[PDB]
Amino acid sequence: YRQLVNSSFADLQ
Amino acid sequence: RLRYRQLVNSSFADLQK
Amino acid sequence: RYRQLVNSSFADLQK
Amino acid sequence: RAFAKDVKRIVVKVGTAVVTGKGGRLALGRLGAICEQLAELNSDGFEVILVSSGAVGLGRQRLRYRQLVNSSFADLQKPQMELDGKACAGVGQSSLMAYYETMFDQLDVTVAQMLVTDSSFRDKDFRKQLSETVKAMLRMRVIPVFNENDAISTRRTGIFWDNDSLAALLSLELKADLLILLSDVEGLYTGPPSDSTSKLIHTFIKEKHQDEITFGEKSKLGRGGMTAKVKAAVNAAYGGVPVIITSGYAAENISKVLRGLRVGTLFHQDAHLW
Numbered sequence A: 001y002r003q004l005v006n007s008s009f010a011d012l013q
Numbered sequence B: 001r002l003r004y005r006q007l008v009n010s011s012f013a014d015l016q017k
Numbered sequence C: 001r002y003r004q005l006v007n008s009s010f011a012d013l014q015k
Numbered sequence D: 001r002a003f004a005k006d007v008k009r010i011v012v013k014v015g016t017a018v019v020t021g022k023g024g025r026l027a028l029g030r031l032g033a034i035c036e037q038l039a040e041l042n043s044d045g046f047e048v049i050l051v052s053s054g055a056v057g058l059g060r061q062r063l064r065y066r067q068l069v070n071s072s073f074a075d076l077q078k079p080q081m082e083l084d085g086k087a088c089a090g091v092g093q094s095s096l097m098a099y100y101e102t103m104f105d106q107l108d109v110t111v112a113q114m115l116v117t118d119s120s121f122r123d124k125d126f127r128k129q130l131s132e133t134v135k136a137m138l139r140m141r142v143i144p145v146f147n148e149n150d151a152i153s154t155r156r157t158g159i160f161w162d163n164d165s166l167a168a169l170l171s172l173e174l175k176a177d178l179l180i181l182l183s184d185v186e187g188l189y190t191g192p193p194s195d196s197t198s199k200l201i202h203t204f205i206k207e208k209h210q211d212e213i214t215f216g217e218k219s220k221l222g223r224g225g226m227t228a229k230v231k232a233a234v235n236a237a238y239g240g241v242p243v244i245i246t247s248g249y250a251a252e253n254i255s256k257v258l259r260g261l262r263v264g265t266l267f268h269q270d271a272h273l274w
């Protein structure tokens, strides 16, 4: 989660 | 392109599942 | 402040 | 409107309001109609010089989305600050020239990116070379797209930091016949158009329409709004260029003005003998 909350929409891509 | 659209429309609570 | 952002969509944040 | 017969060099001007509609989105509806009308005019033997504006809005919108895509969720916590005082402008001018090309490559009319600063102007020997260049470019049936470079400037006299005045100066320098100032409203009213007290006028008399023109209780400032527009028009008229202010949310109007159908407001140096 923290990773998800500390990620870039570009990263999420 | 469709993956981009899906990610643009998704809700953060949906990026976990 | 938090919950909204959590459930909102990247598009939405662009309002 | 008798001058409409003998005009073969016009300087139209689309303001940011005309170009952009919602959320830094090019008004494809308005811009397309205006470009189509300009292409039809060009074909009918008319030197059409286009002075456009709206790069700042497009740059602001695209740099917004280029922040949120490259932002961390934590960042989304606090409303982001100003994007920039000049970079939005840069990106937006790029985008606008891009659009124009794409559109003018459908009706086969070539355009050139001529960007001029206030310092470049006022430089002796510049007010000429620009002149000659623009003349040759018009001669090969090309439509220039003038603008004010807001990305390499240092202002943060001469041009009035507005394309509207830029239009005026260029028109006087390039020795144009007419300068059109397409805007959102149907012309120069007697104040704010919302209330019924303000009434549209059709000719700007020097000593008549300078007592009931507040330019809105609202002072635009950013684009100088109307006051600036009226000033530009007056200056252009005085130098020897008739100037007409008209709505731009309807391109068809341009043909009516050029053909002569009593539409808009006239800022003519022949006010006494009219």
Ligand SMILES: Nc1ncnc2c1ncn2[C@@H]1O[C@H](COP(=O)(O)OP(=O)(O)OP(=O)(O)O)[C@@H](O)[C@H]1O
Binding pocket: D014, D015, D016, D017, D018, D053, D162, D163, D164, D183, D184, D185, D187, D188, D189, D190, D191, D192, D193, D213, D214, D215, D216, D220, D222, D223, D224, D225, D226, D227, D229
């Ligand atoms: N005296 C007036 N009569 C009619 N409308 C007015 C008056 N004063 C202010 N306004 C309003 O303010 C606005 C001023 O428009 P403005 O000239 O700033 O747009 P613009 O030409 O796109 O500016 P720019 O291109 O420099 O960004 C008009 O849309 C008009 O509705």
Ligand SMILES: N[C@@H](CCC(=O)O)C(=O)O
Binding pocket: D016, D052, D053, D054, D055, D056, D089, D093, D147, D148, D149, D150, D161, D162, D163, D164, D223
């Ligand atoms: N900065 C905008 C125009 C600024 C203005 O409204 O005059 C551009 O370069 O296109």
Ligand SMILES: [Mg+2]
Binding pocket: D162, D164, D220, D222, D223, D224, D225, D226, D228, D229
């Ligand atoms: Mg203005």
